[PDB]
Amino acid sequence: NNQQ
Amino acid sequence: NNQQ
Amino acid sequence: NNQQ
Amino acid sequence: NNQQ
Secondary structure: OOOO | OOOO | EEOO | OOOO
16 A cells, blocks of 8 residues: 555 | 545 | 565 | 665
């Protein structure tokens, strides 16, 4: 779970 | 789950 | 912007 | 912006 990566968010940028 | 990647979001950019 | 790198995601892994 | 690096994410791993």
